C-alpha cells in the first residue's frame, strides 16, 4: 500500500480488510475518499443498513 | 591469576552478622533451617558459664 493511501486508511480506521465505518461527507472527507478509491467500496446507507 | 578472592565491605559484613544473629532468635527461621528445636526451653538458648570449663 502506497504511503498516502496507507495513512488515509488508518485515519478512516479501516486498518483491516472488510472493515466498515460511517463517514460524514464534506469537502474534507470526500477528497480523502478519492485518494483511497482503489481500496474501498463506499456509498450512501439507508436506515435499514444503519 | 584468576581472581579467586573477593573484597566485601566491613559494614556489609557486620550487617550480615547482625542479620544472622537476629534470625537465630526466631523459632520459625531456626525450624526452617531443619534444626530439631521443638523442645529447647527458650530462644535464644543461654546456658550458665560453667560449661566454658
Amino acid at each position: 500500500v502506497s504511503p498516502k493511501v496507507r495513512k488515509v486508511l488508518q485515519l478512516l480506521r479501516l486498518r483491516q480488510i472488510f472493515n466498515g465505518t460511517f463517514v460524514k461527507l464534506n469537502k474534507a472527507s470526500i477528497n480523502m475518499l478519492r485518494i483511497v478509491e482503489p481500496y474501498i467500496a463506499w456509498g450512501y446507507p439507508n436506515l435499514k443498513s444503519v | 591469576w584468576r581472581r579467586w578472592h573477593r573484597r566485601v565491605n566491613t559494614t556489609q559484613k557486620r550487617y550480615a552478622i547482625c542479620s544472622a544473629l537476629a534470625a537465630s532468635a526466631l523459632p520459625a527461621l531456626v525450624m526452617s533451617k531443619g534444626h530439631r528445636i521443638e523442645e529447647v526451653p527458650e530462644l535464644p538458648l543461654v546456658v550458665e558459664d560453667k560449661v566454658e570449663g
Binding site: 486508511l9 486498518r15 480488510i17 | -
Partner: protein, 187 residues
C-alpha cells in the same frame, strides 16, 4: 492481516523493585493496597518510586529539605522523600522538621531529632497519613550525577559543553587540536 506496528506494544516501566530487599517489598505490599484501594494519587506516586532504581532515587540533602519546607504555607507538613536524607554540613541551624524517608544518615538523624523534629518510616506515614494528606513530597536532584556532565552533543561539536572522557586531566590531555584556533581549529 491488520496494519499495525508492534514495536511499541510493550511499555518499558517498572512494576516492582528490582531489589530483593524484603523490607522494601513489605512497603510495596503496603502501598500496593493503598494505591489500589484509595483515590489518592500521592499513594500512587509513592508506590511508583519504591520501584525506582538507585539513580532514580537521588539523596535529598538536609539543606534542600529545609529550603523547600520553608516556603510559605508548608508549615506543619510532613516532608516525604522516597530515598535517603543526607546531611549538609554547610547548614548552620536546623529547624524543627517532620520527615519521612527510606533512610536517614546517622548524622542527619541527630541533627533532625536534636531540633525537636520527628523521623517517620513509610509504614508509619501510612498510619499517620493514609491518603498522604498534609505532606510535601520531595525529590533529590536527578541530574546531580557525574554522568550527566558527559551527555549531550559530542564534545567535538560547536557549542558542545559536554565533558569528555580523559584518563588524566592536564595540559597534555586533549587540549591541542580542536580546542584552540592556534592548533588547527576550534568550535
Amino acid at each position: 492481516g491488520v496494519d499495525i506496528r508492534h514495536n511499541k506494544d510493550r511499555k518499558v516501566r517498572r512494576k516492582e523493585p528490582k531489589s530483593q530487599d524484603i523490607y522494601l517489598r513489605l512497603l510495596v505490599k503496603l502501598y500496593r493496597f493503598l494505591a489500589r484501594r484509595t483515590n489518592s494519587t500521592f499513594n500512587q506516586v509513592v508506590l511508583k518510586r519504591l520501584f525506582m532504581s538507585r539513580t532514580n532515587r537521588p539523596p535529598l540533602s538536609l539543606s534542600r529539605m529545609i529550603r523547600k519546607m520553608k516556603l510559605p504555607g508548608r508549615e506543619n507538613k510532613t516532608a516525604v522523600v522516597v530515598g535517603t536524607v543526607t546531611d549538609d554540613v554547610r547548614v548552620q541551624e536546623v529547624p524543627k522538621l517532620k520527615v519521612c524517608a527510606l533512610r536517614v544518615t546517622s548524622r542527619a538523624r541527630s541533627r533532625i531529632l536534636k531540633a525537636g523534629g520527628k523521623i517517620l518510616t513509610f509504614d508509619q506515614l501510612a498510619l499517620d497519613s493514609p491518603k498522604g494528606r498534609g505532606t510535601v513530597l520531595l525529590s533529590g536532584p536527578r541530574k546531580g550525577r557525574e554522568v550527566y556532565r558527559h551527555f549531550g552533543k559530542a564534545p567535538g561539536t560547536p557549542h558542545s559543553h559536554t565533558k569528555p572522557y580523559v584518563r588524566s586531566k592536564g595540559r597534555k590531555f586533549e587540549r591541542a587540536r580542536g580546542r584552540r584556533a592556534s592548533r588547527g581549529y576550534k568550535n
